[PDB]
């Protein structure tokens, strides 16, 4: 139904551009946004993500398999400036979790960010949150470069070798709680950001 394993549920995800007009006025543009699931054979995407060491094939083999999703974004790129990322997770357990985000060009890791997040109790469950985390410089320049390509065919061709892997882990037990693979296209002119969510299998 949703991006949820037995132990973690992603409630919200977004990457955005924020501009301050005056001290009382803000404008925000969402590049991508998440607030029955077809499946995708994980062997079809192995080469788009790093392997060898902490690889995507090794991660899935160790499982659990109900924690591996693929998100396909049609990103809206139609736009001093703050570039950020926000996410929110729910769990029925109070744990200390770790989020590893790896940006890859051509299946080769290029940026890595690790973050630790703690729970807040709310109405019987536990919330984890990344708020207005600064988008790193590689991504900001990549977006600027994308917007400078001559046509959407060149942007989407470039984006075919751009992926992000997110692994969320229980810091104590090292259990994989959520693993999300992200593939991207540019949304078509006045379509706005859209996505499909898949379960990864086999």
């Amino acid at each position: 139904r949703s991006i949820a394993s037995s132990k973690l549920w992603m409630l919200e995800f977004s990457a955005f551009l924020e501009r301050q007009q005056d001290p009382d006025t803000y404008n925000k543009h969402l590049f991508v946004h998440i607030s029955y699931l077809e499946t995708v054979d994980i062997r079809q995407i192995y080469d788009k993500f790093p392997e060898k060491k902490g690889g995507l094939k090794e991660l899935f083999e160790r499982g659990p398999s109900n924690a591996f999703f693929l998100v396909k974004f049609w990103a809206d790129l139609n736009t001093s400036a703050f570039y950020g990322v926000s996410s929110q997770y729910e769990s029925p357990e109070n744990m200390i979790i770790t989020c590893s985000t790896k940006v890859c060009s051509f299946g080769k890791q290029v940026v890595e960010k690790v973050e630790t997040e703690y729970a807040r109790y709310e109405n019987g469950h536990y919330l984890y949150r990344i708020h207005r985390s600064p988008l790193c410089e590689y991504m900001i320049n990549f977006i600027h470069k994308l917007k400078h390509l001559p046509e959407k065919y060149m942007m989407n061709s470039v984006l075919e070798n751009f992926t992000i892997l997110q692994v969320v882990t229980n810091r104590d037990t090292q259990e994989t709680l959520l693993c999300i693979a992200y593939v991207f296209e540019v949304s078509a002119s006045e379509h706005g950001a859209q996505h499909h969510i898949y379960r990864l299998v086999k």
Partner: peptide
């Protein structure tokens, strides 16, 4: 490089909502 559209993916993969 094997193009993504020649790989076996659900048809939805290229159908933007």
């Amino acid at each position: 490089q094997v193009p993504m559209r020649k790989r076996q993916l659900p048809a939805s993969f290229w159908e933007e909502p």
